[PDB]
Amino acid sequence: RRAASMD
Amino acid sequence: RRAASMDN
Amino acid sequence: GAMGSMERASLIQKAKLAEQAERYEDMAAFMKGAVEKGEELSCEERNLLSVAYKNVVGGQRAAWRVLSSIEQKSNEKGPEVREYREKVETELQGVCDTVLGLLDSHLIKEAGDAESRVFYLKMKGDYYRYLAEVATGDDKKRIIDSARSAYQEAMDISKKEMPPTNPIRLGLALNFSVFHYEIANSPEEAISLAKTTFDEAMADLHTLSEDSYKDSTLIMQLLRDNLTLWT
Amino acid sequence: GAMGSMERASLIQKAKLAEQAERYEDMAAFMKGAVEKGEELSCEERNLLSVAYKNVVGGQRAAWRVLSSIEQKSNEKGPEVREYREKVETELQGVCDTVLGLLDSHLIKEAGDAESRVFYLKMKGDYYRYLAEVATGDDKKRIIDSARSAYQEAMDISKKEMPPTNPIRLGLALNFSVFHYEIANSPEEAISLAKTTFDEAMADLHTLSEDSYKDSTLIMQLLRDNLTLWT
Numbered sequence: 516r517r518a519a520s521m522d
Numbered sequence: 523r524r525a526a527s528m529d530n
Numbered sequence: 531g532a533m534g535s536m537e538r539a540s541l542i543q544k545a546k547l548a549e550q551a552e553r554y555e556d557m558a559a560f561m562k563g564a565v566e567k568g569e570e571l572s573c574e575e576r577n578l579l580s581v582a583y584k585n586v587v588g589g590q591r592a593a594w595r596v597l598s599s600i601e602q603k604s605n606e607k608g609p610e611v612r613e614y615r616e617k618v619e620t621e622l623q624g625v626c627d628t629v630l631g632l633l634d635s636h637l638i639k640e641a642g643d644a645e646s647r648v649f650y651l652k653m654k655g656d657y658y659r660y661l662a663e664v665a666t667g668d669d670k671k672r673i674i675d676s677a678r679s680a681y682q683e684a685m686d687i688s689k690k691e692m693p694p695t696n697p698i699r700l701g702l703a704l705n706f707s708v709f710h711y712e713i714a715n716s717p718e719e720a721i722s723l724a725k726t727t728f729d730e731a732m733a734d735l736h737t738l739s740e741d742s743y744k745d746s747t748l749i750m751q752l753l754r755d756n757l758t759l760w761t
Numbered sequence: 762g763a764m765g766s767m768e769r770a771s772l773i774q775k776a777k778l779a780e781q782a783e784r785y786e787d788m789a790a791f792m793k794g795a796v797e798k799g800e801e802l803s804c805e806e807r808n809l810l811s812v813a814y815k816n817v818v819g820g821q822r823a824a825w826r827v828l829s830s831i832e833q834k835s836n837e838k839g840p841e842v843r844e845y846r847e848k849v850e851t852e853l854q855g856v857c858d859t860v861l862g863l864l865d866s867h868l869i870k871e872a873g874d875a876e877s878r879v880f881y882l883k884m885k886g887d888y889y890r891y892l893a894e895v896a897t898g899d900d901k902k903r904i905i906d907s908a909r910s911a912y913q914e915a916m917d918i919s920k921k922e923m924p925p926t927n928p929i930r931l932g933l934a935l936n937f938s939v940f941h942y943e944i945a946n947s948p949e950e951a952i953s954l955a956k957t958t959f960d961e962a963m964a965d966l967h968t969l970s971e972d973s974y975k976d977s978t979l980i981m982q983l984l985r986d987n988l989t990l991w992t
Contacts, residue, residue: 516990517943518938518939518942518943518987518990518991519935519939519983519986519987520887520935520936520939520983521932521933521935521936521980521983523759524712525707525708525711525712525755525756525759525760526704526708526752526755526756527656527704527705527708527752528701528704528705528749528752529748530577530580530581530584530745540839540841543839543841544841544844544845547828547831547841547842547845548845550827550831551823551824551827551828551849552820552823552824553824553849556845556848589783592782592783593782593783593784596781596782597778597782600778600781608771608774610771610774610775610778611778613775614775614778614779614787617787618782618784
């Protein structure tokens with residue numbers, strides 16, 4: 516799964 | 523409110 | 531055109547990729563390319579063309595409505611809202627002129643099955659109707675006349691060559707009733723066509739195929755939803 | 762450019778209309794015109810610039826990932842999937858080159874408060890990262906150094922000049938941490954930075970207003986979801 520970045 | 527037309 | 535060096539089968543494949551990537555402007559441009567090869571479209575290919583352009587002009591119509599309503603409220607205030615509404619409007623007319631160009635130059639023929647001829651005459655009616663939504667004056671009257679002649683020719687063919695539960699015959703009647711009501715200021719025509727269409731489909735309501743039943747019955751319900759709205 | 766004859770205030774107003782109509786390509790073009798007037802942006806205007814470009818490049822990144830996935834299935838055929846992937850990739854690169862052009866030509870300055878300098882250097886790191894996701898070879902290596910170096914400069918400023926709970930400082934560390942893990946092949950540095958960041962902010966949460974507690978804790982939760990994911 517892709518990591519989350521700022522919104 | 524607007525009437526519905528066909529989808530797709 | 532810009533798709534002139536690409537093989538027809540490659541254009542159709544890429545239209546399907548654009549669809550999966552939700553890139554509807556690309557999808558439409560690939561289907562335009564395919565149509566311009568000058569061969570008939572299959573039923574699957576007709577539906578790719580219709581989906582691609584409906585999504586594009588669908589987004590423009592929604593933006594036009596958001597901007598038109600912001601503009602209405604501030605008539606009670608610089609020119610910015612009107613200018614931007616005009617820009618969107620002009621793009622929307624370009625897309626409808628593209629679709630209407632494809633139907634008249636390539637797709638509408640005297641040959642082909644009844645299904646295909648109705649499909650394209652109905653789409654002609656629809657894209658004139660979207661133009662009528664934003665038109666004024668003498669231009670709107672010419673547009674309304676063009677929409678009506680396309681829908682009526684499609685109605686004449688559908689009533690004589692298709693069963694009354696066929697989803698394209700139904701969708702055509704639905705669209706033409708909306709034209710009567712919202713465009714042509716003929717509420718009684720609209721209500722009469724929607725009732726008659728609903729009533730004549732009831733005979734066969736129990737006997738739909740695994741393909742038509744969700745579309746058939748969804749459209750039957752849309753006819754009722756509109757009839758509620760209008761009465 | 763195409764926006765040269767329009768007043769700055771009118772460009773900002775149309776940017777906000779485009780946003781309400783969900784027309785992010787238009788919104789980005791109106792904001793670029795505003796930026797090209799040569800005046801600094803307010804905090805509200807920076808956020809319009811950012812939202813507009815982020816929505817445009819976000820749509821292209823999503824499409825590219827859909828296509829790159831289909832491309833990798835069908836390499837385990839025909840050239841069409843790769844060709845269409847390259848086409849989307851080239852459009853995404855064009856957008857990133859536009860944004861990085863604006864940052865270098867107009868927005869990144871030695872002057873201005875810390876919030877603005879960090880905001881634009883973070884954005885530069887981010888648009889180089891989006892180029893790095895699609896790049897190969899020596900090009901990718903150059904892009905990775907450019908991203909690192911922008912992020913690092915913004916980290917330097919935000920440690921000097923902002924508290925550990927500041928949402929801009931936190932968002933920068935979240936994004937740099939994602940760079941370390943997903944682009945620079947440095948999982949150790951990613952986990953380490955995200956932990957330090959989370960922990961230094963945790964230390965000050967008891968001392969915050971209820972607003973600040975929520976803002977910060979939202980980003981702290983992203984830092985923690987990524988740590989779960991990476992450990």
